[PDB]
Amino acid sequence: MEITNPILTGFNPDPSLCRQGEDYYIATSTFEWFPGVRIYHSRDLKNWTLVSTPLDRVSMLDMKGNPDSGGIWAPCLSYADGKFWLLYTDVKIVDSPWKNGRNFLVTAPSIEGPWSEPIPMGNGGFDPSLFHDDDGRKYYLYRPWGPRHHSNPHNTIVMQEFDPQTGTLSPERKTLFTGTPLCYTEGAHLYRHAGWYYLMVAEGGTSYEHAVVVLRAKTIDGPYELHPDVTMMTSWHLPENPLQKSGHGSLLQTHTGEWYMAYLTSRPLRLPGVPLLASGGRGYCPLGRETGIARIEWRDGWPYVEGGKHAQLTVKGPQVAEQPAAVQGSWRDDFDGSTLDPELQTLRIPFDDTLGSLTARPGYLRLYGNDSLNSTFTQSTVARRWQHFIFRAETRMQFSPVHFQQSAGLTCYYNSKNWSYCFVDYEEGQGRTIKVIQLDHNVPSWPLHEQPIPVPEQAESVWLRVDVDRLVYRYSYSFDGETWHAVPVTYEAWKLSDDYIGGRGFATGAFVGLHCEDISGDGCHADFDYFTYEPA
Amino acid sequence: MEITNPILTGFNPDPSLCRQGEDYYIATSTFEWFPGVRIYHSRDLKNWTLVSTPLDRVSMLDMKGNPDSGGIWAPCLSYADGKFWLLYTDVKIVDSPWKNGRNFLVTAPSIEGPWSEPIPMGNGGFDPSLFHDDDGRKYYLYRPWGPRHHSNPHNTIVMQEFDPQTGTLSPERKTLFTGTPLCYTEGAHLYRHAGWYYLMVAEGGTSYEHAVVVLRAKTIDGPYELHPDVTMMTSWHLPENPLQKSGHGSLLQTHTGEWYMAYLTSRPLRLPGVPLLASGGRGYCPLGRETGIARIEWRDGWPYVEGGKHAQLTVKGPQVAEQPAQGSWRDDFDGSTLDPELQTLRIPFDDTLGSLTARPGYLRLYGNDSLNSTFTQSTVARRWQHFIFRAETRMQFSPVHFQQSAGLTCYYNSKNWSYCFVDYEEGQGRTIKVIQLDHNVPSWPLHEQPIPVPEQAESVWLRVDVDRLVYRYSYSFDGETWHAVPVTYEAWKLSDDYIGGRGFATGAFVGLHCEDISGDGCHADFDYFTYEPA
Amino acid sequence: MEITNPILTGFNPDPSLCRQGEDYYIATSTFEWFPGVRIYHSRDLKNWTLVSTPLDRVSMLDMKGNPDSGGIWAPCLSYADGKFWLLYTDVKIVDSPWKNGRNFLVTAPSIEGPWSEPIPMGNGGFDPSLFHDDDGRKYYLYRPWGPRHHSNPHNTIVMQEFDPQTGTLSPERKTLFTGTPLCYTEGAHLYRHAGWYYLMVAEGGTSYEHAVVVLRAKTIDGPYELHPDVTMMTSWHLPENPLQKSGHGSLLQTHTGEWYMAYLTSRPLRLPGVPLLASGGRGYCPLGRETGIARIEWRDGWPYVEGGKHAQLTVKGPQVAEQPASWRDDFDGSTLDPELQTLRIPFDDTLGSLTARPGYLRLYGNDSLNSTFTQSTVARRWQHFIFRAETRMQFSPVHFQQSAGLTCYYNSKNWSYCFVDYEEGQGRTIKVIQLDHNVPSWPLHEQPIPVPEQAESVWLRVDVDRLVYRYSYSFDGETWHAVPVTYEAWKLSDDYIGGRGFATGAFVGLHCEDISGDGCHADFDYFTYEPA
Ligand SMILES: [Ca+2]
Ligand SMILES: [Ca+2]
Ligand SMILES: [Ca+2]
């Protein structure tokens, strides 16, 4: 069996890999996108399909007003004592010398079954993890944040004992590790194999310096000794490697006795003429931080990645038959049923009658006019991940705005300060027109407002389409579905990436979605017949 | 007979002036501080006292997660048909090419309440205003915002007819004015006097270029023609005038027949050596945008400010009796209610932040988020109202690790403040440290060598002395002998003049705080909180 | 035998390694410091001694008004046909999307002159090289610059045939190499060993991504094939290696039949708490780009660096016996000590004098340290992370624009300067000025340090200790007082300053200025440099 990486394409960072018997699960972070956490299932480690979006109630995740790249960071999904355990962090500050957040524990006997009310696990840091030792005791790990605890200078891994019968954490903290010169020590996971406790952490930050560092000790509280190579996985030293930023590992032993590690990684696109190791020369990643997997071998009590430290595109799969669940390729929601397609997500808040409805006009997705795309509160935006470098997204829209503050259409979105948006609005002199708005480092670009493209009065529908092709992407429209016209504006797909945006936020990924807004608050709605995503 | 400006000192902008009979009221904006809107009362237009904080529950104002300088922008308070009408905006986006928000209307039969639930008045802009015409019909004004409507290039003043019986706004908008080259046309107000409608706007932005601009028309829908001098008030051309940024006017005719206009203004502190007209040369305003008032005279059907366009420190008071006469303040935390001089950030003061009932005579503050959070800070602060003062408190606190701290803060927004606190250190014990955020950049010079606190020191006194350009923290262990924290902080950095950005000037605060980044649970107790001006 | 790197310490980049029989020479760049080019000699490749500063006439090197990090870039010293050949570049634009300059050739029958007047060699690029082919023909290489030729996107290596009897160049250019994705292709040198032509270039830029790239071909015009490992030397992949930025190689076969390569390298100081691979985490280099040497082995017609690609502190020396050869200038002689240099212009009577007051170096009052024209500044290199520099000064200013003292200097926008001046209400005072990213810092102008009126001499001293340094003074020569300002030594490096200028290295020297132009002078009894 040959596994091609990434196993989870598009925005899918911080893979937490677990297993229940012969069923394997990975949980990835979702940041400000609702619902929180995405859980994928596989029986062969090669083909993964979404099976659970657990944090789908405000009582579990209340992310309105959360900053960009806040919300759900790295989760921990483990299985023990007949149920799954899910730890997650809701981060409330991002653009600051230090951050605040909240950690919670939810459990469920089955991966899709209803998850319990959250248990507060503290606020002192991020990357929470739960270790189930062989003696029945349980230990809660995390990396503390705060003043001087963002690698200025401190970045530590602490441990509290956890009582599962009372849901209590003991007030004592034991520092397990303080980090190597790479620093950014985070993502701690504990394992017990042979006579050793193994401590796996991420270091070097989640960009091109990302690495997986492993330590080991005889007792759980230390002292820990470094892996002889220090870093177990990294691709920093191979700048031409297809997979980059390989870190934040999650080690698992299969039911067949084999060893695999899930990790996050990114696939960069490079600009012509830029030296490879200059600033920005290593590339830009519109598909954000994705999830890969590597086969692990053991030598003299230490784990190694087969073939080398770097993330490889192809790895050797386990001793099982390939058992795919979902058909791959094209994607479309015709909005014929009761629920949005699970590949669609909202910004911060859940989808309900406030943002839209699937029953007001059956066969259409109706979106109500609320805030514009730059808002961290109430956007009627329904978006899905960029999962390929070349694809087309298309919709058919019916919309009748009455003034300039009502608009609706298609958007390619990264955060509230970096997106583009091709929409239909009303102009007081002409009528319905198509315009485009782009935010680039929070700087606006609206080149069609002075001379917009007229929408014919008799046009019952306005088809909208975006064609993404590596570094660029363009919008196109149609009033009959057969004859299309390009919006004469070329957009930079590489700008929809943390490599370009920068700041304190972490790389998520580019989305494409349907949006309708009414800054006036008067009230309006846009009906969308379908939404398509077709890879090349 | 002589009124000395500012009349409302400290963070007090957008003064909406109205009257009910012989009682006069001014409502000021409060931005992200809760409760929202502050209403002051007066019978001589000289001596003002706070009488109402109307938006004091989440169903009226829900600001958790609001950005800095979001929240309550310019309010409008009016009286008509036997009740008070209060329009206000809850702004949800600030640092963006354009903003979003929500407008609401609440009513009350009397200034102290009870106030209604909010009626949504649309989201299309800010500076809402309700005009009650003589024929019983009501009109709603605002500045539309959005893409290309933050003076890039558009800044319009539109009007909708309002049906008070059902709270309905008509969909049609009528543009009244599109602005002059000064731009930033906002703060629209309609008045009917003589045989003219008068439209009063603010232009030039709320900084040193602030101005009040008046138009008039025979009919309400226009077209409006400009004042002979366009600008009726501004101090931009006098860079050494004591009062600066004079704009955003609120015109009112008294029960005596006289005319008075409330406006916002700032008193800048200048750094030495900086040329006056170079960047930052006109000064820095740690007291924020305050409220002044001026007498208005009429000539040829146009209004004028007495003695010139600029804002003067002294003006002539109305023809009413002077009442007895910004002052010394202290809260001993005896009652079950916070002193109305104190406010919280965004969220109300309930048992999540603290309690005045859990320990009588003490303000108990529970440990939540740090001072850089827009969600749940246990922070209770009051306004800077003088350039020279001293704030003080007596605190009891015994943390157990480094993420528990509590103390005193001088605060402007989530990215600009200083914080002198007691925390714990594993090998030492209780220590005193300082943290400053300056342009979101941290300073913590006392972390590698902190000030120790004795083990059986039941109480730590904290004190900050502000002296114009600088301020310094100090501590005590006995209430008798005090020691200086050897850090001098810049008071001119707690100002919009220094911070910049797309947020607007609010004002510096001083307050009490306690946090637990760990979420384990802690609490600090404060016996009192004094504000003593020099 | 064990060689310890760097073999040349302090500001000593772009080592051009040549040999005349059993005598080995290395020429290094000097940028805006006059005289230009420093040529060191050795007979064992371990111990090196300065022997020649050849570009010491304005007719050879006219650098007045040159921008910071302009002037002399990478030179090429070679020996052929009974004389030395020295190619050099005088760069005239730095802070611009592309640069201009001038390339010159001078020759000499011996290493210490006489050096001929310069022959123009074209202005189209930098890093000039002269290859002496075994058939008698000569070839001139350089990397062209200009619009879109600063790795945006182009970085080429071109070759022109040089006609030695007439000193002219063929107008035709042959492109030898266009670069790997590392780009910044420069520093080309040609070699003929066995039956191959070898093209050696530098790639990755002269910071922490520096690398030596090697190609080979059967004919001199190519096409050239890349080394099996592409990069023959680099330390980029080892961020904790003591030697960093190891690139711009110069290969040479000794008279023993052994092969060595000089290369530039840097030794960084790291701030505490800064992540190793974050910005600035790899370190700051106050000693600038120094020179190391490595032993080369051959394997199937390809050269390799012994032990690995990275630069090592200790390498194996050649098959010759070791032949070895603190600092102070008492200003006793007709000349400054050759370790001292001036900025752009030669040291003549307008700047100073050693004969006006015998036994003292007298410096006259001209421009201040921020000037690219005429400052009376005389400085030497930092060569250690911990040292002390001292001087005894006699100076009597009359107004506030006359000052003189001790300076630690990187470029015209980054330096510190402790001096004696005159204040209108007090008399002689001691003050300090720091330029930090061209931002001024004068914490003592409001409360200066008074100088006793009958103190005939004011001693000045700077103590450098790795990351920080401090000034001290005295009025008797035995009891010293610190000046209560601590300066950052790591800021006197290209790692901190940034910009389009390239890493030179920190200097320390003596300075006197008169902004008024009235006329002043300061006498210096001595100048000491004493490492720890
Ligand atoms: Ca449909
Ligand atoms: Ca009390
Ligand atoms: Ca002497």
Side-chain angles (χ1 to χ4, degrees), chain C residues 330 332 359 525:
Chain C
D330 291 303
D332 285 332
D525 181 50

Side-chain angles (χ1 to χ4, degrees), chain C residues 13-111 113-122:
Chain C
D14 306 313
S16 204
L17 171 57
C18 78
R19 88 170 168 90
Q20 174 188 34
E22 298 181 325
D23 294 307
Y24 302 84
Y25 302 90
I26 283 183
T28 52
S29 41
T30 43
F31 283 73
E32 70 257 39
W33 297 91
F34 199 89
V37 178
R38 283 170 70 87
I39 307 179
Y40 307 80
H41 168 260
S42 153
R43 291 191 58 102
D44 53 16
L45 301 171
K46 175 172 175 166
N47 310 282
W48 299 78
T49 323
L50 182 76
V51 306
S52 180
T53 56
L55 312 191
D56 60 353
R57 306 197 295 281
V58 166
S59 69
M60 322 171 61
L61 189 52
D62 190 1
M63 292 192 298
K64 183 158 83 200
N66 270 25
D68 285 337
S69 185
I72 293 297
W73 281 18
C76 191
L77 180 66
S78 58
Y79 185 73
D81 307 332
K83 50 189 186 150
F84 289 89
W85 311 67
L86 181 62
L87 298 177
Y88 59 96
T89 317
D90 186 2
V91 184
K92 301 298 190 186
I93 320 182
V94 166
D95 183 37
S96 183
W98 69 91
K99 312 193 179 61
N100 289 354
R102 296 95 174 79
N103 288 297
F104 297 109
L105 161 69
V106 297
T107 63
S110 154
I111 199 59
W115 293 91
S116 53
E117 289 309 323
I119 296 172
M121 297 291 288

